[PDB]
Write an enzyme that holds these catalytic residues in place. Structure first.
Site, PDB file in Angstrom:
ATOM      1  N   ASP A 121       7.924  -8.320  -8.907  1.00 26.76           N
ATOM      2  CA  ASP A 121       9.174  -8.616  -8.207  1.00 26.76           C
ATOM      3  C   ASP A 121      10.302  -8.948  -9.226  1.00 26.76           C
ATOM      4  O   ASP A 121      10.092  -9.720 -10.168  1.00 26.76           O
ATOM      5  CB  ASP A 121       8.899  -9.817  -7.293  1.00 26.76           C
ATOM      6  CG  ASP A 121       9.985 -10.035  -6.278  1.00 26.76           C
ATOM      7  OD1 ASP A 121      10.831  -9.168  -6.136  1.00 26.76           O
ATOM      8  OD2 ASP A 121      10.061 -11.102  -5.660  1.00 26.76           O
ATOM      9  N   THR A 159      13.825  -7.113  -1.699  1.00 27.91           N
ATOM     10  CA  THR A 159      12.380  -7.107  -1.877  1.00 27.91           C
ATOM     11  C   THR A 159      11.620  -6.273  -0.845  1.00 27.91           C
ATOM     12  O   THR A 159      10.937  -5.320  -1.177  1.00 27.91           O
ATOM     13  CB  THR A 159      11.875  -8.568  -1.897  1.00 27.91           C
ATOM     14  OG1 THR A 159      12.592  -9.259  -2.926  1.00 27.91           O
ATOM     15  CG2 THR A 159      10.458  -8.637  -2.253  1.00 27.91           C
ATOM     16  N   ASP A 308      10.109  -3.701  -8.020  1.00 26.47           N
ATOM     17  CA  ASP A 308      10.871  -3.385  -6.801  1.00 26.47           C
ATOM     18  C   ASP A 308      12.397  -3.217  -7.019  1.00 26.47           C
ATOM     19  O   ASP A 308      13.022  -2.387  -6.358  1.00 26.47           O
ATOM     20  CB  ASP A 308      10.571  -4.381  -5.687  1.00 26.47           C
ATOM     21  CG  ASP A 308      10.778  -5.823  -6.108  1.00 26.47           C
ATOM     22  OD1 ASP A 308      11.215  -6.106  -7.250  1.00 26.47           O
ATOM     23  OD2 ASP A 308      10.503  -6.666  -5.249  1.00 26.47           O
ATOM     24  N   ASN A 685      26.108  12.509  13.616  1.00 29.95           N
ATOM     25  CA  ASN A 685      25.159  11.421  14.020  1.00 29.95           C
ATOM     26  C   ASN A 685      24.548  10.664  12.823  1.00 29.95           C
ATOM     27  O   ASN A 685      23.540   9.933  12.937  1.00 29.95           O
ATOM     28  CB  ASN A 685      24.050  11.983  14.934  1.00 29.95           C
ATOM     29  CG  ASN A 685      23.208  13.071  14.252  1.00 29.95           C
ATOM     30  OD1 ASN A 685      23.485  13.515  13.124  1.00 29.95           O
ATOM     31  ND2 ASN A 685      22.130  13.453  14.900  1.00 29.95           N
ATOM     32  N   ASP A 691      23.955  18.975  11.208  1.00 29.65           N
ATOM     33  CA  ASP A 691      24.181  18.972  12.662  1.00 29.65           C
ATOM     34  C   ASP A 691      24.030  20.375  13.241  1.00 29.65           C
ATOM     35  O   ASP A 691      24.426  21.379  12.628  1.00 29.65           O
ATOM     36  CB  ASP A 691      25.603  18.533  12.982  1.00 29.65           C
ATOM     37  CG  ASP A 691      25.842  17.069  12.759  1.00 29.65           C
ATOM     38  OD1 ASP A 691      24.889  16.294  12.485  1.00 29.65           O
ATOM     39  OD2 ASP A 691      27.028  16.718  12.879  1.00 29.65           O
TER      40      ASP A 691
HETATM   41  O1  LIG Z   1       8.583 -15.105  -0.704  1.00 28.22           O
HETATM   42  C1  LIG Z   1       8.811 -13.874  -0.774  1.00 28.22           C
HETATM   43  C2  LIG Z   1      10.213 -13.272  -0.976  1.00 28.22           C
HETATM   44  C3  LIG Z   1      10.989 -14.098  -2.035  1.00 28.22           C
HETATM   45  C4  LIG Z   1      12.221 -13.366  -2.559  1.00 28.22           C
HETATM   46  C5  LIG Z   1      12.389 -12.492  -3.645  1.00 28.22           C
HETATM   47  N1  LIG Z   1      13.797 -12.194  -3.763  1.00 28.22           N
HETATM   48  N2  LIG Z   1      14.440 -12.778  -2.856  1.00 28.22           N
HETATM   49  N3  LIG Z   1      13.549 -13.517  -2.069  1.00 28.22           N
HETATM   50  N4  LIG Z   1       7.732 -12.995  -0.652  1.00 28.22           N
HETATM   51  C6  LIG Z   1       7.930 -11.521  -0.655  1.00 28.22           C
HETATM   52  C7  LIG Z   1       6.524 -11.067  -0.274  1.00 28.22           C
HETATM   53  C8  LIG Z   1       5.927  -9.715  -0.661  1.00 28.22           C
HETATM   54  N5  LIG Z   1       4.502 -10.052  -0.781  1.00 28.22           N
HETATM   55  C9  LIG Z   1       3.512  -9.143  -0.747  1.00 28.22           C
HETATM   56  O2  LIG Z   1       2.340  -9.494  -0.868  1.00 28.22           O
HETATM   57  C10 LIG Z   1       3.849  -7.685  -0.522  1.00 28.22           C
HETATM   58  C11 LIG Z   1       3.460  -6.673  -1.399  1.00 28.22           C
HETATM   59  C12 LIG Z   1       3.701  -5.365  -0.956  1.00 28.22           C
HETATM   60  O3  LIG Z   1       3.386  -4.392  -1.815  1.00 28.22           O
HETATM   61  C13 LIG Z   1       3.576  -3.033  -1.408  1.00 28.22           C
HETATM   62  C14 LIG Z   1       3.088  -2.152  -2.584  1.00 28.22           C
HETATM   63  C15 LIG Z   1       4.047  -2.312  -3.761  1.00 28.22           C
HETATM   64  C16 LIG Z   1       3.684  -1.269  -4.891  1.00 28.22           C
HETATM   65  O4  LIG Z   1       3.646   0.064  -4.376  1.00 28.22           O
HETATM   66  C17 LIG Z   1       2.727   0.209  -3.279  1.00 28.22           C
HETATM   67  C18 LIG Z   1       3.218  -0.702  -2.097  1.00 28.22           C
HETATM   68  N6  LIG Z   1       4.249  -5.017   0.214  1.00 28.22           N
HETATM   69  C19 LIG Z   1       4.655  -6.021   1.049  1.00 28.22           C
HETATM   70  C20 LIG Z   1       5.302  -5.557   2.312  1.00 28.22           C
HETATM   71  C21 LIG Z   1       6.026  -4.208   2.324  1.00 28.22           C
HETATM   72  C22 LIG Z   1       4.681  -4.344   3.034  1.00 28.22           C
HETATM   73  C23 LIG Z   1       4.481  -7.372   0.737  1.00 28.22           C
HETATM   74  C24 LIG Z   1       4.256 -11.552  -0.982  1.00 28.22           C
HETATM   75  C25 LIG Z   1       5.693 -12.057  -1.124  1.00 28.22           C
HETATM   76  C26 LIG Z   1       6.285 -13.386  -0.572  1.00 28.22           C
HETATM   77 CA   LIG Z   2      11.916  -8.466  -4.792  1.00 29.15          CA
HETATM   78 CA   LIG Z   3      23.154  15.154  11.552  1.00 27.63          CA
HETATM   79 ZN   LIG Z   4      14.633 -11.962  -5.335  1.00 28.20          ZN
END
Ligand SMILES: O=C(CCc1cnn[nH]1)N1C[C@H]2CN(C(=O)c3cc(OCC4CCOCC4)nc(C4CC4)c3)C[C@@H]2C1
Ligand SMILES: [Ca+2]
Ligand SMILES: [Ca+2]
Ligand SMILES: [Zn+2]
Ligand SMILES: *[C@@H]1O[C@H](CO)[C@@H](O[C@@H]2O[C@H](CO)[C@@H](O[C@@H]3O[C@H](CO[C@H]4O[C@H](CO)[C@@H](O)[C@H](O[C@H]5O[C@H](CO)[C@@H](O)[C@H](O)[C@@H]5O[C@H]5O[C@H](CO)[C@@H](O)[C@H](O)[C@@H]5O)[C@@H]4O)[C@@H](O)[C@H](O[C@H]4O[C@H](CO)[C@@H](O)[C@H](O)[C@@H]4O[C@H]4O[C@H](CO)[C@@H](O)[C@H](O)[C@@H]4O)[C@@H]3O)[C@H](O)[C@H]2NC(C)=O)[C@H](O)[C@H]1NC(C)=O
Ligand SMILES: [Cl-]
Ligand SMILES: [K+]
Ligand code: NA
Length: 805
Positions: A121, A159, A308, A685, A691
């Protein structure tokens, strides 16, 4: 309700999640308050820490320990990741020489190389160079494997939208996760970072990689980790899963790190506090790679290290407040921060007016740090409009700034020094990609690419068929040693007509005039040859575009340009012409200022007419091939054909005329000739797709001449600029744009100045990929080059961003 009285004994980090009220032992149970009573005791052991020491070597297995250093630990699959190093005299992975992995070297019973995706992240692209000294494991993956100098995230560079685009290959408007915060008016429900709503499956569209894998019989590690499970335990759990028997073992795994984003928000992207988080992530990579080496998997697994989005310097004092622009600030709801989204606070308030909110936000203060847009007028490259969760009113916030509704919001919610979310072209928002393993290339640098392309490649690495997505499959073939995907070019659906001279001038009653009545065997042969395509190889360099939908159109040849003219839309779908470095710009002669000429190849009934333009007090017209670049006074008459005319708002003609008169010649000078393809786009749209006629919401008054929402140009030359565009032996270079066809220039705050101060800036903002234009037009370009098709797919995904180094 959870019956938390069951037990995790032998279930720790179980792969199939059990449904309520039975208690859970999977890596997500904490997040649901649903873990069995004994999950911490059994599954989150911490005793004696994460590393073997000399004195633990050959120890008697104590099951309470976080990881083991006993003799049986390799067969149990639960040694500390540094076991072989401390106890068996082995080297850490990072200390071993880089050796090419030509074939997977996998233990018996492995059907395919596993894929491990390690996502970080807020890992800004330039961390790879600027933190190189403190990240030796990551630097070894990078230098030994395949890496890009950066990877472009999607907009908004938040994120959840980016992680889910990584998972699905889809733009946020298509997958549905359009922000970290959302309101869906159909559900009447809100999605937030904190809380339970975000877990509901109705938010999450498309088909993410773990579901694609499972449907096709490839087992997936659970991708998500509750925040309080430490990194070291996540890695150990992955390594333990990799020791499962063949029929139980997943083939794809995910690890996610909250760092460096977490510290970057507090300290800014390059705060001195940022060194330690980078060291720690590197240490985790080191643990994984050592653990893989112990399992004899380090030359078997493909590892992706991917971010990300990046992180920019943003402080509380750099906030714009809507309360400084709007009188009615309490009648709006703002989603605030590094982007703005505005809607009415109450749907019962019928004096809410978006027109007047936009006007009050437009060019109001000399240095204003956000620009308002109706979402359909956002740069098409953002692909940020076709979802009911995206509010009609959008604010594009300048890098380094925030927008908020009222000052009290910024202190009754300075803390933070970093944030992200800005336009995905911004340098600080770029992020990282490294691929390492048997399937990736060795010591290979690849050009920057967009994160929407990765799902297809992750599917390629696992032998999966991707669900339909926004990547262009084959465009990332150059990252891969094997498992390439070898697409065929789409089949042309409509073939062109090639009309000859079929109409007399007096059959036309278009209300057009031209001063062209001036009357030679030498040059009569020539004009005939030119109308039959004799110069076509000069002006149509990469083949004619293919029409990928059912329609009726004509190819028209001329001395200076060739076009595909639509009998349905009454204008070209495309116009192709080449301008050499040597070409001269001329003016439109005085006597030809209002000249429009019937085209005797094309029926009155399939032509535009000048009377509609005269009657339409708002609409004027422009030309696709520019009369300024005619090769000779006589060729210039071709540029005034009714079949080269397109409708243009006077405000837009300021933009267009400056592009055609000044910029094309400038590019041909700088690039050693350019080939230009220009045309209209209709996307009423705002779905990013061509379109059909029945979607067109505006016509030139009193006629069936449809009005384009946008005009595109694709500008191609030789990558080796020592060769002229029309004699290029190797790879191509391209830039493109999709300019909004607007009746005002309100978007450009400096538009009352000379075009030299604002037009090129506008065009840069609306830079585009060829592929974006393909979606918007149903055309397929570059059909006849000497280049491989995968290389052409990469060229079509290229985006010229105009950011500095
Ligand atoms: O607390 C904050 C946000 C804090 C924040 C950061 N910036 N601003 N606020 N969390 C943000 C959450 C994300 N998370 C995950 O475990 C997570 C990982 C993931 O991986 C997909 C893979 C990535 C690599 O390629 C294949 C797909 N996909 C998802 C969600 C989309 C399905 C979630 C725990 C964190 C707690
Ligand atoms: Ca992020
Ligand atoms: Ca269109
Ligand atoms: Zn952030
Ligand atoms: C990026 O890649 C993606 C993926 O390839 C491209 O999106 C696809 O584009 C297709 C064309 O627009 C579209 O095809 C339509 O599918 C309809 C069925 O859709 C459902 O089923 C699929 C399959 O599982 C599913 O994926 C869909 O998911 C969407 O919707 C749910 C919510 O319902 C969301 O969770 C999810 O996020 C996703 O939303 C996105 O797409 C929808 C459109 O489907 C948008 O509205 C959202 O804003 C969001 O962007 C669905 O659950 C199918 O019914 C369609 O057929 C109708 O329309 C055509 C032509 O208009 C017509 O021929 C038919 O008769 C039929 O019309 C009837 O319904 C009309 C609407 O009510 C009505 O007006 C008529 O009168 C008729 O009664 C159509 O085939 C496909 O669904 C999406 N897929 C995805 C994942 O988004 C995208 O184009 C690419 N972008 C670019 C720029 O290239
Ligand atoms: Cl958001
Ligand atoms: K007019
Ligand atoms: Na203006």
């Amino acid at each position: 309700w959870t019956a938390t009285s069951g037990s995790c004994k032998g279930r720790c980090f179980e792969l199939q999640e059990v449904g309520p009220p039975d208690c859970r032992c999977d890596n997500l149970c904490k997040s649901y308050s649903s873990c069995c009573h004994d999950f911490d005791e059994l599954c989150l052991k911490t005793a004696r820490g994460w590393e073997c020491t000399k004195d633990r070597c050959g120890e008697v297995r104590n099951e309470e320990n976080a990881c083991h250093c006993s003799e049986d630990c390799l067969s149990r699959g639960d040694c500390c990741t540094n076991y072989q190093v401390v106890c068996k005299g082995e080297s850490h992975w990072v200390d071993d020489d880089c050796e090419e992995i030509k074939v997977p070297e996998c233990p018996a019973g492995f059907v395919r190389p596993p894929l491990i995706i390690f996502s970080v992240d807020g890992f800004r692209a330039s961390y790879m160079k600027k933190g190189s000294k403190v990240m030796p494991n990551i630097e070894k993956l990078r230098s030994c494997g395949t890496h890009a100098p950066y990877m472009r995230p999607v907009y908004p560079t938040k994120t959840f939208p980016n992680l889910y685009t990584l998972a699905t290959g889809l733009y946020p408007e298509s997958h549905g996760i359009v922000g970290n915060s959302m309101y869906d008016p159909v559900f009447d429900a809100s999605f937030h970072l904190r809380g339970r709503e975000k877990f509901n499956h109705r938010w999450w569209g498309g088909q993410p990689l773990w579901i694609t894998a499972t449907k096709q019989g490839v087992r997936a590690g659970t991708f998500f980790w509750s925040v309080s499970i430490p990194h070291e335990r996540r890695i150990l759990t992955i390594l333990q899963w990799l020791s499962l028997p063949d029929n139980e073992r997943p083939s794809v795994y995910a690890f996610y790190s909250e760092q460096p984003d977490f510290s970057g928000h507090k300290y800014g992207p390059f705060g001195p506090e940022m060194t330690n988080p980078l060291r720690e992530i590197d240490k985790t990579v080191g643990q994984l790679m050592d653990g893989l080496k112990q399992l004899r998997l380090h030359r078997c697994v493909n590892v992706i290290f991917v971010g990300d989005h990046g992180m920019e310097d943003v402080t509380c004092d750099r906030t714009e407040f809507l309360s400084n622009y709007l009188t009615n600030v309490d009648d709006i709801t703002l989603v605030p921060g590094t982007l703005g989204r505005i809607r009415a606070k109450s749907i019962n308030n019928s004096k809410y007016d978006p027109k007047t909110i936009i006007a009050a936000l437009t060019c109001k203060k000399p240095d204003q740090h956000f620009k308002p847009y109706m979402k359909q007028h956002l740069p098409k490259r953002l692909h940020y409009a076709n979802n009911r969760r995206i509010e009609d009113i959008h604010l594009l916030v300048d890098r380094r700034w925030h927008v908020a509704r009222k000052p009290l919001d910024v202190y009754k919610k300075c803390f933070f020094q970093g944030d992200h979310g800005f336009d995905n072209k911004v340098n600080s928002m770029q992020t990282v990609f490294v691929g390492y393993g048997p399937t990736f290339k060795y010591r290979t640098k690849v050009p920057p690419f967009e994160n929407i392309e990765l799902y297809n490649v992750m599917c390629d690495l696992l032998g999966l068929k991707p669900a339909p997505n926004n990547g262009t499959h084959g465009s990332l073939n150059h990252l891969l040693r094997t498992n390439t995907f070898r697409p065929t070019m789409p089949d042309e659906v409509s073939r062109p007509n090639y009309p000859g001279i079929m109409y007399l001038q007096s059959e036309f009653d278009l209300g057009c005039t031209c001063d062209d009545k001036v009357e030679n065997k030498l040059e009569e042969l020539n004009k005939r040859l030119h109308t039959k395509g004799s110069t076509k190889e000069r002006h149509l360099l990469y083949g004619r575009p293919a029409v990928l939908y059912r329609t009726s159109y004509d190819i028209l040849y001329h001395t200076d340009f060739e076009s595909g003219y639509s009998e349905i839309f009454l204008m070209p779908l495309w116009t192709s012409y080449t301008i050499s470095k040597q070409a001269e710009v001329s003016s439109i002669p005085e006597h030809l200022t209002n000249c429009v000429r019937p085209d005797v190849r094309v029926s009155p009934g399939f032509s535009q007419n000048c009377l509609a333009y005269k009657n339409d007090k708002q609409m004027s017209y422009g030309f696709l091939f520019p009369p300024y670049l005619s090769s000779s006074p006589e060729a210039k008459y071709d540029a005034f054909l009714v079949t080269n005319m397109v409708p243009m708002y006077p405000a837009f003609k300021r933009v267009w005329a400056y592009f055609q008169r000044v910029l094309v010649k400038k590019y041909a000078s700088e690039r050693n000739g350019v080939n230009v393809i220009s045309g209209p786009i209709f996307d009423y749209n705002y779905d990013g797709l061509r379109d059909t006629e029945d979607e067109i919401k505006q016509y030139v008054e009193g006629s069936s001449i449809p009005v384009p929402t946008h005009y595109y140009s694709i500008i191609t030359s030789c990558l080796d600029f020592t060769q002229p565009a029309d004699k290029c032996d190797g790879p191509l270079s391209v830039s493109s744009f999709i300019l909004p066809h607007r009746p005002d220039n309100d978007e450009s705050c400096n538009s009352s100045e000379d075009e030299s101060k604002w037009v090129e800036e506008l065009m840069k903002m609306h830079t585009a990929r060829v592929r974006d234009i393909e979606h918007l037009t149903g055309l397929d370009f570059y059909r006849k080059t000497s280049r491989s098709y995968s290389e052409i797919l990469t060229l079509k995904t290229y985006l010229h961003t105009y950011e500095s180094e």
